[PDB]
Design a protein around this ligand. Structure first.
Ligand SMILES: CCCCCCC/C=C\CCCCCC(=O)O[C@H](COC(=O)CCCCCC)CO[C@H]1O[C@H](CO)[C@@H](O)[C@H](O[C@@H]2O[C@H](C)[C@H](N)[C@H](O)[C@H]2NC(C)=O)[C@H]1O
Ligand SMILES: *[C@@H]1O[C@H](CO)[C@@H](O[C@@H]2O[C@H](CO)[C@@H](O)[C@H](O)[C@H]2NC(C)=O)[C@H](O)[C@H]1NC(C)=O
Ligand SMILES: *[C@H]1O[C@H](CO)[C@@H](O)[C@H](O)[C@H]1NC(C)=O
Length: 550
């Protein structure tokens, strides 16, 4: 029914049921959000009063027509969201005065094209521009981006693209993040050609790339600034994937590639060894795959090409893609790998054993097996001994059987993550070479392991009623024990932790009074730089920083 505006000039008119921009706008309003309304029309004078407006949010109202001079007095507007409305036609007049515009969102409107007039030439301070839609935006023309030199973000949703005019994206000098929504590989070659000098991070969404083909690009040998290339919901084939890899000859500085919810169903499988791009990841050091869907491995593949292709990569992530095995042979060829993340898969000791064979992941430093199907700490550790260079292991979120007294872990292991592992007690299975141990969110009663080199302990989210003994952590820099049900700490205890720099004590039922917690209180008070978060007293949300009894 009405506008709710604060003393900062931030006005909120969302979700009322306005059929037009309300009246009474002032010169003191800084942000006006009239989203999710029913403003079918924006006339010449509606926004004339609020000349100091910096933010105008008008998402999902039902705007279908706006007068060319509707924003004539918004010379300080920096943010304008017209997404998800009923604009069939865009008008350059809107933007003529918005010289301060940094953000503009016209995405989600049923326009077919940007119109026969460059819309953005006066937007000299523009940083984020999102345009397009799912079903009707079908053309991108050469006049479309005239005026713009550089952008942080440029998102173009054109899942219905039917015509891309060559040279359109080429006029922009610098685009840090370009997000493209393409349903087919139809104009990929030319769009790609037009951004070789400008895009540092290209992201392609929802493209069926199964019939993509490569052919040299009629361009000049120029140094491309692309560092990251990401494919979100693509459909690939073994044959098209190889066609895509040839584009790397144009992005020599590419160093990171991502594949999210992609499908890969290579049917015919390439053959011509000459038209085969191998060992061409160039300087790609990070390969990041999430939720990949392969139909079914039934026949022997080969991987000679993949061995070569992954030969110099240092970071690989294959997350939540139902992985149950990485063949030994594969692992032995990943010679430069330092980080490997198999979070959320189906690894069990039985198959890990083959995956971590003798010459497996020779340079591996960090291994993440969070959320898999591991059940035995003793076997996991034994299998991993082959990883001579391993310094950190994350086996959190695996429900392990109670650990034994004696175990064997890689010689140089300093970081061990046993968080959300379900353990009830900790035993000398955990090695003493450890500098970092996470046993948070488990079913612990106490901790009695002497770990001489422990620099950090995470024991938060457990049932410990009393702080573990301080003689167990001579060189401890960090202790986390929030959410644990501690009522008090021994007086002067922190003098005994001669290295402590950070400690988490919040979310415990501290007992505040006069004859107790006088130490904790004062210590926390004069060590605010050390306490992370804040321990509050019980029976009173008041923090444990309350002077008591003179
Ligand atoms: C830089 C260039 C790019 C470099 C990229 C490097 C990437 C390296 C890692 C890639 C991993 C991709 C595959 C992930 C995966 O885990 O794929 C499964 C098998 O994985 C392997 O065997 C190892 C292949 C290594 C290839 C290396 C290139 C498929 O399993 C399929 O075949 C299995 C029998 O073999 C079936 O049991 C399974 O059935 C499925 O099992 C499910 C667990 C569930 N029960 C389903 O219901 C079931 N399907 C049914 C029953 O219809 C089915 O999905
Ligand atoms: C040990 O592994 C756990 C489990 O994944 C990590 O905890 C997650 O941390 C991220 C970012 O800090 C959070 O978004 C999640 O909510 C956490 N999950 C859980 C278990 O609550 C934890 O950070 C790892 N420990 C260290 C020191 O790296
Ligand atoms: C582990 O990694 C280092 C660094 O690449 C490598 O040089 C060394 O040979 C590896 N150690 C073993 C035993 O393979």
């Amino acid at each position: 029914e009405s506008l709710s505006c604060d003393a900062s000039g931030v006005c909120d008119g969302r979700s009322r049921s306005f059929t037009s921009i309300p009246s009474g706008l002032t010169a003191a309003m800084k942000s006006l959000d009239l989203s999710f309304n029913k403003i079918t029309y924006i006339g010449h004078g509606d926004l004339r009063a609020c000349a100091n407006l910096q933010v105008l949010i008008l998402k999902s109202s039902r705007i279908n027509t706006i007068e060319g001079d509707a924003f004539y007095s918004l010379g300080s507007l920096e943010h304008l969201d017209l997404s998800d409305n009923h604009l069939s036609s865009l008008s350059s007049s809107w933007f003529g005065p918005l010289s301060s515009l940094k953000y503009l969102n016209l995405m989600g409107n049923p326009y077919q094209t940007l119109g026969v007039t460059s819309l953005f030439p006066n937007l000299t301070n523009l940083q984020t521009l999102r345009i397009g839609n799912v079903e009707t935006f079908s053309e991108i023309r050469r006049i479309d981006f005239a005026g713009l030199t550089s952008l942080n973000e440029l998102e173009i949703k054109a899942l219905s693209l039917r015509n891309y005019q060559s040279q359109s994206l080429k006029s922009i000098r610098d685009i840090h993040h370009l997000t493209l929504h393409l349903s087919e590989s139809a104009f990929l070659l030319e769009i790609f050609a037009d951004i070789l000098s400008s895009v540092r991070y290209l992201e392609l969404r929802d493209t069926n790339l199964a019939r993509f083909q490569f052919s040299p690009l009629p361009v000049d040998e120029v140094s491309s600034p692309m560092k990251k290339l990401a494919f979100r919901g693509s459909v690939l084939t073994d044959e098209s994937f190889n066609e895509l890899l040839k584009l790397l000859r144009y992005i020599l500085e590419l160093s990171e590639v991502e594949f999210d919810d992609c499908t890969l169903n290579g049917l015919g499988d390439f053959n011509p060894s000459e038209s085969d791009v191998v060992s061409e990841l160039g300087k790609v050091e990070t390969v990041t795959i999430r939720r990949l869907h392969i139909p079914q491995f039934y026949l022997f593949y080969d991987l000679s090409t993949v061995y070569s292709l992954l030969e110099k990569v240092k970071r690989i992530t294959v997350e939540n893609s139902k992985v149950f095995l990485v063949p030994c042979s594969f692992s032995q060829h990943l010679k430069s790998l330092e980080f490997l993340d198999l979070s959320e898969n189906l690894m069990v000791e039985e198959y890990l054993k083959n995956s971590a064979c003798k010459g497996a992941w020779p340079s591996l430093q960090t291994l993440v097996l969070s959320q898999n199907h591991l059940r035995s700490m003793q076997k996991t550790g034994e299998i991993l001994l082959t990883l001579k260079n391993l310094t950190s292991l994350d086996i959190s979120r695996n429900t392990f059987h109670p650990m034994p007294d004696s175990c064997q872990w890689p010689e140089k292991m300093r970081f061990l993550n046993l968080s959300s592992t379900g353990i009830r007690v900790v035993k000398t299975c955990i090695p003493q070479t450890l500098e970092v141990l996470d046993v948070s969110n488990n079913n612990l009663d106490s901790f009695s392991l002497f770990l001489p080199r422990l620099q950090e302990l995470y024991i938060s989210r457990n049932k410990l009623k009393t702080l573990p003994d301080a003689s167990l952590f001579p060189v401890l820099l960090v202790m986390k024990i929030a959410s644990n049900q501690l009522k008090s700490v021994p007086d002067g205890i922190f003098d005994r932790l001669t290295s402590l720099q950070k400690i988490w004590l919040h979310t415990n039922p501290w007992d505040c009074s006069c004859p107790r917690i006088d130490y904790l209180s004062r210590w926390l008070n004069k060590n605010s730089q050390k306490e992370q978060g804040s321990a509050k007293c019980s029976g009173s949300g008041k923090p444990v920083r309350s002077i008591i009894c003179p």
